[PDB]
Amino acid sequence: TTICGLVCQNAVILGADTRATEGPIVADKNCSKLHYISKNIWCAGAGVAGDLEHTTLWLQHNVELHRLNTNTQPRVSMCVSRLTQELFKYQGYKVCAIVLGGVDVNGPQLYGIHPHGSSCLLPFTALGSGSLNAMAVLEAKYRDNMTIEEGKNLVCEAICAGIFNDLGSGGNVDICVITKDSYQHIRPYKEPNMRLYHLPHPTIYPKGTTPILSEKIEY
Amino acid sequence: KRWYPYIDNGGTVIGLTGKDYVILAADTRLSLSYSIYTRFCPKISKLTDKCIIGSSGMQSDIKTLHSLLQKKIQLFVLEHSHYPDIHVIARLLCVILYSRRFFPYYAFNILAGVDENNKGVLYNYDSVGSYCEATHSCVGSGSQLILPILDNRVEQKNQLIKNTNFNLGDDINFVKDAITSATERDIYTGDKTLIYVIDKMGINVNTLDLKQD
Amino acid sequence: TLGPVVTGTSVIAIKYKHGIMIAADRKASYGSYAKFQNVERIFKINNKTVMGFSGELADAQYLHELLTRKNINNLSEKKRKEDMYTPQHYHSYVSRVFYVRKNRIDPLFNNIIIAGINSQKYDNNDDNVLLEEYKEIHKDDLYIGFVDMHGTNFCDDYITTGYARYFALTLLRDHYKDNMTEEEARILINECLRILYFRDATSSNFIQIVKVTSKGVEYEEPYILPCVLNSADY
Amino acid sequence: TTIIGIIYDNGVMLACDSRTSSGTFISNKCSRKINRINENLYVCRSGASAHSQKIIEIIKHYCVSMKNENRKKGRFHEGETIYDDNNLVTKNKYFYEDKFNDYNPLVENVAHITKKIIYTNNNFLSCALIFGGYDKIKKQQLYAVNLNGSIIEKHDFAVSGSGSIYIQSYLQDKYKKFMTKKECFNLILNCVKYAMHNDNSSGGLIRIVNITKSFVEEFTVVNTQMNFQ
Amino acid sequence: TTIIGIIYDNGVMLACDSRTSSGTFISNKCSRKINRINENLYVCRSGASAHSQKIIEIIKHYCVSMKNENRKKGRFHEGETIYDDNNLVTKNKYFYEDKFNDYNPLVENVAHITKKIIYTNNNFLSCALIFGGYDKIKKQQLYAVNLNGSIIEKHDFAVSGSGSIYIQSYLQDKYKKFMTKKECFNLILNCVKYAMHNDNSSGGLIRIVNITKSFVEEFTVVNTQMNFQ
Amino acid sequence: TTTLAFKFKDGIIVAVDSRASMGSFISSQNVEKIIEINKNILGTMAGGAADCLYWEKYLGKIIKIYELRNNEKISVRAASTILSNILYQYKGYGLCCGIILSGYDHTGFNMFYVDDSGKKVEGNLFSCGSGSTYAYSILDSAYDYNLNLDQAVELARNAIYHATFRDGGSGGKVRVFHIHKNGYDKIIEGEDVFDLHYHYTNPEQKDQY
Amino acid sequence: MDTLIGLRGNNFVVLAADTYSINSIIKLKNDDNTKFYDIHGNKCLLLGGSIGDRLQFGEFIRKNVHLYQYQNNTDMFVKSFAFFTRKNLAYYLRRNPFEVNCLIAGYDKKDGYQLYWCDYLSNMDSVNKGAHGYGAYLVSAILDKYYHENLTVDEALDIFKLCFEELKKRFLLTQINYELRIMYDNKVETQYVTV
Amino acid sequence: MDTLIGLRGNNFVVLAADTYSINSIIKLKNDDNTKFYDIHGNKCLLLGGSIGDRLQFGEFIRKNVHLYQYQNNTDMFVKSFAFFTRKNLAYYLRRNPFEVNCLIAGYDKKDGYQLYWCDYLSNMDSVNKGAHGYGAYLVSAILDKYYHENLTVDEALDIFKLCFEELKKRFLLTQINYELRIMYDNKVETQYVTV
Amino acid sequence: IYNYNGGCVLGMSGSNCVAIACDLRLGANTFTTVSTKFSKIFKMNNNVYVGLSGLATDIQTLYEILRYRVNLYEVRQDAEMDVECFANMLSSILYSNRFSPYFVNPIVVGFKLKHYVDEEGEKKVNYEPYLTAYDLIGAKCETRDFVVNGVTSEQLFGMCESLYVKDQDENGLFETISQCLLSALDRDCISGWGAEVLVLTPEKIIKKKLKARMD
Numbered sequence A: 001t002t003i004c005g006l007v008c009q010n011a012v013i014l015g016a017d018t019r020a021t022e023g024p025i026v027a028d029k030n031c032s033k034l035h036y037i038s039k040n041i042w043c044a045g046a047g048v049a050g051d052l053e054h055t056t057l058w059l060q061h062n063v064e065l066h067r068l069n070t071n072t073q074p075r076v077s078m079c080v081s082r083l084t085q086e087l088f089k090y091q092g093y094k095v096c097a098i099v100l101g102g103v104d105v106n107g108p109q110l111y112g113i114h115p116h117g118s119s120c121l122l123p124f125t126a127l128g129s130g131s132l133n134a135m136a137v138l139e140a141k142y143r144d145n146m147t148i149e150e151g152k153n154l155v156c157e158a159i160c161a162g163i164f165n166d167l168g169s170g171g172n173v174d175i176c177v178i179t180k181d182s183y184q185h186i187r188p189y190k191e192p193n194m195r196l197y198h199l200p201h202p203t204i205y206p207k208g209t210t211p212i213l214s215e216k217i218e219y
Numbered sequence B: 001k002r003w004y005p006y007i008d009n010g011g012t013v014i015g016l017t018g019k020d021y022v023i024l025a026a027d028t029r030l031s032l033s034y035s036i037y038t039r040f041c042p043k044i045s046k047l048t049d050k051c052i053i054g055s056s057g058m059q060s061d062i063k064t065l066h067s068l069l070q071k072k073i074q075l076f077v078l079e080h081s082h083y084p085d086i087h088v089i090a091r092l093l094c095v096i097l098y099s100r101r102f103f104p105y106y107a108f109n110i111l112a113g114v115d116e117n118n119k120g121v122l123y124n125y126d127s128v129g130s131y132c133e134a135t136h137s138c139v140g141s142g143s144q145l146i147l148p149i150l151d152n153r154v155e156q157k158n159q160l161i162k163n164t165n166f167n168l169g170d171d172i173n174f175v176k177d178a179i180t181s182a183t184e185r186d187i188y189t190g191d192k193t194l195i196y197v198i199d200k201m202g203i204n205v206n207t208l209d210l211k212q213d
Numbered sequence C: 001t002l003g004p005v006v007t008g009t010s011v012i013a014i015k016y017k018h019g020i021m022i023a024a025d026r027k028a029s030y031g032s033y034a035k036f037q038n039v040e041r042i043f044k045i046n047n048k049t050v051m052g053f054s055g056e057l058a059d060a061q062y063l064h065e066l067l068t069r070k071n072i073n074n075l076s077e078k079k080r081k082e083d084m085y086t087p088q089h090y091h092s093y094v095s096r097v098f099y100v101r102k103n104r105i106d107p108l109f110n111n112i113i114i115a116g117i118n119s120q121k122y123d124n125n126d127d128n129v130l131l132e133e134y135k136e137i138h139k140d141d142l143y144i145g146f147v148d149m150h151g152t153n154f155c156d157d158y159i160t161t162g163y164a165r166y167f168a169l170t171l172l173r174d175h176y177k178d179n180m181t182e183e184e185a186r187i188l189i190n191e192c193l194r195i196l197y198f199r200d201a202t203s204s205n206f207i208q209i210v211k212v213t214s215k216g217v218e219y220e221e222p223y224i225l226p227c228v229l230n231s232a233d234y
Numbered sequence D, E: 001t002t003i004i005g006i007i008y009d010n011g012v013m014l015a016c017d018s019r020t021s022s023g024t025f026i027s028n029k030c031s032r033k034i035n036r037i038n039e040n041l042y043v044c045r046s047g048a049s050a051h052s053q054k055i056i057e058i059i060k061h062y063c064v065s066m067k068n069e070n071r072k073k074g075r076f077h078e079g080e081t082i083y084d085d086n087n088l089v090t091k092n093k094y095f096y097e098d099k100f101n102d103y104n105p106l107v108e109n110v111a112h113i114t115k116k117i118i119y120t121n122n123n124f125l126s127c128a129l130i131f132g133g134y135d136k137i138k139k140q141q142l143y144a145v146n147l148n149g150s151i152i153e154k155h156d157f158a159v160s161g162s163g164s165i166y167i168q169s170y171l172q173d174k175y176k177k178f179m180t181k182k183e184c185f186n187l188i189l190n191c192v193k194y195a196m197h198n199d200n201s202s203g204g205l206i207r208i209v210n211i212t213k214s215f216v217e218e219f220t221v222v223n224t225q226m227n228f229q
Numbered sequence F: 001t002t003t004l005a006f007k008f009k010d011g012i013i014v015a016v017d018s019r020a021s022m023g024s025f026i027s028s029q030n031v032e033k034i035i036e037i038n039k040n041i042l043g044t045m046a047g048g049a050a051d052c053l054y055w056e057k058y059l060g061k062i063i064k065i066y067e068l069r070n071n072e073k074i075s076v077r078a079a080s081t082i083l084s085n086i087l088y089q090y091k092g093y094g095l096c097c098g099i100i101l102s103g104y105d106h107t108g109f110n111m112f113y114v115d116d117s118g119k120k121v122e123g124n125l126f127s128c129g130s131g132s133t134y135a136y137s138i139l140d141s142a143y144d145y146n147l148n149l150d151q152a153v154e155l156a157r158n159a160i161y162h163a164t165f166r167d168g169g170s171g172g173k174v175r176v177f178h179i180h181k182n183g184y185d186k187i188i189e190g191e192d193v194f195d196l197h198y199h200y201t202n203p204e205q206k207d208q209y
Numbered sequence G, H: 001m002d003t004l005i006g007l008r009g010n011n012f013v014v015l016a017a018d019t020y021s022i023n024s025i026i027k028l029k030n031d032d033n034t035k036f037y038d039i040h041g042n043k044c045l046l047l048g049g050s051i052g053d054r055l056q057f058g059e060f061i062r063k064n065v066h067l068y069q070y071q072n073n074t075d076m077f078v079k080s081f082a083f084f085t086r087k088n089l090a091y092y093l094r095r096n097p098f099e100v101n102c103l104i105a106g107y108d109k110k111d112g113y114q115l116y117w118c119d120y121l122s123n124m125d126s127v128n129k130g131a132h133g134y135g136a137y138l139v140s141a142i143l144d145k146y147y148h149e150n151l152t153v154d155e156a157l158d159i160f161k162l163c164f165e166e167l168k169k170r171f172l173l174t175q176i177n178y179e180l181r182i183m184y185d186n187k188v189e190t191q192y193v194t195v
Numbered sequence I: 001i002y003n004y005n006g007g008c009v010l011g012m013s014g015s016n017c018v019a020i021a022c023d024l025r026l027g028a029n030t031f032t033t034v035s036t037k038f039s040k041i042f043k044m045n046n047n048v049y050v051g052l053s054g055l056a057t058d059i060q061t062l063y064e065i066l067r068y069r070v071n072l073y074e075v076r077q078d079a080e081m082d083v084e085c086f087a088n089m090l091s092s093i094l095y096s097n098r099f100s101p102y103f104v105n106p107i108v109v110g111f112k113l114k115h116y117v118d119e120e121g122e123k124k125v126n127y128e129p130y131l132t133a134y135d136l137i138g139a140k141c142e143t144r145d146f147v148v149n150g151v152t153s154e155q156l157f158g159m160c161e162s163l164y165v166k167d168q169d170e171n172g173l174f175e176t177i178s179q180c181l182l183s184a185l186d187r188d189c190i191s192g193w194g195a196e197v198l199v200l201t202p203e204k205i206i207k208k209k210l211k212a213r214m215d
């Protein structure tokens, strides 16, 4: 749970780790914590994965329904007002810190939501357990109007700082670029290799015990 | 407001014994709740030429429990003029651990060594003065994960008991296999691990590198 | 002794090629109220060792008395330059006292850092407890110890305690190179302290940077200047 | 946080720090606390950040609803033409100014917007607000909405937030009945800077907003304090 | 309560309100909080009244014990003769002055008396003290003993008690490095009066004590505050 | 945890499982719960692991001194009385251990269930542990006191199986001993995959129950 | 607190329960209690737990099942009867406790003789042998050791006698009076045993 | 949990108690328990409450009383024995629970046959009839209705039979086995009754 | 998820087949078993197998709802329901009880049923494994290989990580998942009174009940 995002010269860049944990142990090394709200806005979240995953689905489809009744591309501020009112109703129970960034008729804007319903427009941020580790490297290196390429690898360092220094975050890093025309969501981007690889040793066919075998064929 | 005096610094210690040796492996990462203090804090401290101890509890207790135990062992050597056997040490650690039953050490210990010609032997404790000889034992964060793995390869539920022989070289590779599995499946397991092989002549401290996440 | 009402803040200690460089803000806050902004949190307990600080000020002031009189007792029973206690010796003494308090339930809330030069190859056998050129130290003669209030003790090449254990630690872990020079160490430490100014509420400017070199312990008071990132636009 | 409001001779001045701290950690620097409700009045919001922001959203909806409702039908003021710095001494003083839609027929009173809050947060909701703006009848005025919905009109000045207590007596001394714009700006700038020097809820840049009869000007100041003693 | 200490050019000035409140009720007005420890230093006591009074009794016993212990045997300064208002403008300013037993051979340092407290209240005891007095080596000095026994030498000024926060920035502004006796008295008088105007732990009369090289003068002032705004 | 004892026709048959589990995880499955307290007297662990392994082996220390100063073997009644007293000094300290001391002394075959609260009791068919109720249930319906050795150990093995069958925290290898008139022997240091032996002899199905 | 025992064979299902009334916990109240709720369609429902909740729940099940069999001329299947009972028990679970333990039993033309075991938490599952209450810890082992495939009705009652003289001998409150409900050969036979 | 009954006449004192071992509360452990602590000087001490505390307290009283009667060739009086037991029970009361209920009984040359009743809180007082445990609520009424002045020993046992078949019939845990201790004619007779 | 009614559910993916396994225990209290037939693997559809682990009340109650809605979807559709549509339904069903949760940890296993031409003379095509795992509030932790839930989730993760290989046929996959389950249940004292491995292929379905240790 290390998510981050920053505003660039004409686009927003969102980066996130890939790891879901039961708290002592890790469930999977590859969880897409980035989410598609619309073609021009994307969101990333932290907190409980239950409330986090539904809310984005609820947000994405409300936005899409809004983008159909209305005939213009969705506003970034529209989702912030939609989420925060939803989060405000459930006083603090729907705990999900969310960063959503995108572009609209205004500039590339990025918002950091909070589980209690508060929001704030930022040039760069980071949430999750590795937020503090990721926010440090962000501040030390952030500038205004960074180029897309230069700002893209800054998030790589921003996430990798949380990947390595935080226990609760790890795995591959994934990035999304939310430029006006379209997005670019790169699913693998990092996490180097060359450890002691486990030798595959499959147990032979005559194993197990199987008191019963109720074979049947369906069609 | 109450100052709970117990924290877990994580890390796992793996023990596995063979016919004429014993392999003690542990990580070196020392961490707080979710941040990381240091990337190299050894959890294994040698006691005699042929007996080492590994602990995977709270690092403040581990440092003083090993230090207390070597202090006792060296005191034993001076008064009795012979290095204690592992059975002597294992029993002594039971008394020391139980001496604070009502404020127990927050450390789980694995004691490994050789007593016979070889007779690779290994003991495991649970934070309070109790020890049983085991063919394989692991404690710490990865205890829940590694112990099933060690069981499937050392003992058997398998229909045919293959790999009845177990040379030293393969067992080292097996522990490297195991300790890597815990690393990529556990939050607190380390990034650099020390593997000890208490053979007939002595101990090796060959080091293996693990993931850093 | 029960609840840290008058707390310090993070201190940062790194070892460079001429010795140890340890820095700390000079503010102690009464909770959410910067009651004192000129207290010092880096003490000299030996001609070659220094002592860190974090958490409650009363406990770390009491700890300073113990280490101070431990030095003088050594100094009275000192015959040659090699009799002086190493920084490692005080670390193993601070570790023991923190642990003894932990068996009881009076842990004296602190995150003490003990740093210094662990060698006697640079002569200071003329002690003036009451008041040339630097040498190159092999980085193995330098000790930087840490002591958590649970008793957790370890040594490293860059011990950041308090709250810099989240911001300054990430910078050091990807920027600290061996045998850093004098000013390069400061610009690295200054970059770590600047971040804590924006991102820590209970921190400030007016740093006290202390360096432990072959000549002893120095002092100076910068006023590190945070101003970046252009949030002024409205 | 800290929040000030000073009523000078021909307007009202609102200032605040810009920092949302969450338990000795700043979630973000440069957080807006002088929120625009209508062209002529602004709101200083404090307390729990989640509660204050969601109150402001409700009030803007009420403000819009009552602004266009009290719009008289026809054309008014046919022939009438009733109309009328600090020059970066404080370094990095950003600035812009906008003008009203004057005569105040459409825009509603500040007292109207004020008791929206009581009617809204007479509840188990923790937020203290300061209301300031220009009004057709009562020229310039400053309402302090307390924690449980207790408004009182402050005719001199109003302070709130954690840092208010540190400048409670500083401001009571430097205040004068009819201060000019320059004196009021310096007073409100130094009040915040002193409330920031000795409070761990000290903002980053400080945002000062001035409401006058015909315009609102907004400043953001980036400065610290260095006493010589 | 409130407690101030200001170090001016040739001495140190201690002031306090006089009220021991017990839960929005004043158990008694005119309670002494500037307590004499020795002829040359005084103590300002705050926090829980029971704890502070019983600490002072212990310290006076230590102070007496160490004063006559560090008495050198014979006769000293055989031939040496080293020696050297506010006129009721503040109404009902009671007053008297006493002189020391000079050269300071007998009386002990303020720093000595100061860490008696740490050595004594490094415990579960809630009291914050301010120590001020004259000393042979360090001329005039002002120690602030915090809640858990945290002394730091304050070279400019020290404040404590509930009302300190209300004048934290008032005093940081009006302070000058070397104030004369008259300026220091007015500053310390107005600091207390402002800390009293806006705090329900405001005393009755306020007691101001001045420690100089050769004498201590004590004032009690009976006055209130009336701002004009 | 399971424990048995019989005082049957010509001895005592003590039987235990070999499972040591913390929380819901099986820490070990080859623990020895029978302890050589004496040549003739042997105890049993239950409840907390160290709170009885330490004290029983501490009790063995007390007996060894007593058996040497008096040069007569101690009695089970005296050994149990010693143990119950020392466990009584730790009432509120959180000890937890149920010990069944069975052995042979001059006054015949004796058994004494000893619990962490100084609960000394003389009986014939004690059983302790989480699965003790199921172990009691089998024995009460098959106990005779006229059983010979061959079918006494079979009954003990049968009871331990059914206890480990119904109980989550009881399992692993089955240990069944026998106490002679002079010493004791280890009859079964055995196994526990014999569910498919007693009932459901042929592996054909899932053994519905 | 009260013991319910059930045993299922290929041609029989026997339900056992003590006839005690634990109410006024300091004492017994009735020596011949009524916990069985016989249903018309060759079904029975044995309840344990609190006496107050047994009447409210068991009687409610009996009416609904009878109403089902009157609206629909069929006889409600045991599988339907078992899983409909679990549904209602779980339905009220998050609204009202009903600390009642069920032991569903019956005979069905298509599925034969079936036994169902239900906890106060609705944990319905078909079993060959059940045991509720604190006496379950002492009668489950007999139900395993002495039970084998295709028992006859007489042997099953011999097993139940073996369980009863166990609760008398070892169980804390020595229940002495028990009531059985033997279902076999299209009959619902009732007999009371003692000791 | 365990029932102690005592009855005092002009020439007898009979102490009754169940022989049950409630330990491992889910079940009984022994069917013939030992709660009586007979003292040498024609005295008895019947304890209830926790089995662990009965051995620690009752045995301790027995040694001290025996030590008193060996240091001093006399036999310790029942009044001394009763009030010395209360003293030790109260002495430990504020330092260790000892949830044990006493029923002191004995014969004395000067005071005849005496019965003493003691609660876990040391509330010693001489009575003509006592009853401890939860069974006291069900046996005290028989001890009043059917007891009159100067009973003989045979009638007293008939009264005790009347109490026993009451705990079987109405008490929650139907205790069946009881042990008596009849003191009369300079004898301490022991007999076991059942049902 | 509770120690009460301790049970675990495991799923694994082979080269062209998937295997779903569980333990058959039904423990009344923590350490008290009452049944060993309590199969936790249900057949939602011909190639959609769901595995419910946790409290048996919520295991059954949720299964009724799932079976009530899959049938309603399929019947109203005249079309076989696919996993990723069903899988998301299970995610929303659990979330609808966000504050009165169904204490279960479901596993969804079954083929994905792509529908390209497969030839100039074919209609439907090869299948995809599609393993996924949830929790009590329905977090879609989709995974390309083995997924686990239950009280032995942590015991199963370790063994599966060290034994699972990339692709295996029906015979190879069954052995690995059986070893990954038997030796993981033997380390749990509240689950594992008999396993039931159910490996299924596009053509056939194999049900095997292992001779697991019952202790």
Ligand SMILES: *[B]([O])([O])[C]([C]C1=[C][C]=C(C2=[C][C]=[C][C]=[C]2)[C]=[C]1)[N]C(=O)[C]1[C][C][C]N1[C]
Pocket (backbone or CB within 6 Å): B130, B131, B132, F001, F019, F020, F021, F022, F023, F031, F032, F033, F045, F046, F047, F048, F049, F050, F053, F129, F130, F169, F170
């Ligand atoms: B039983 O499950 O209750 C169990 C009893 C037990 C097991 C093992 C040993 C032992 C230890 C060391 C060497 C030899 C033998 C003694 C007693 N105890 C427990 O399950 C409890 C639960 C959690 C803590 N204990 C293990």
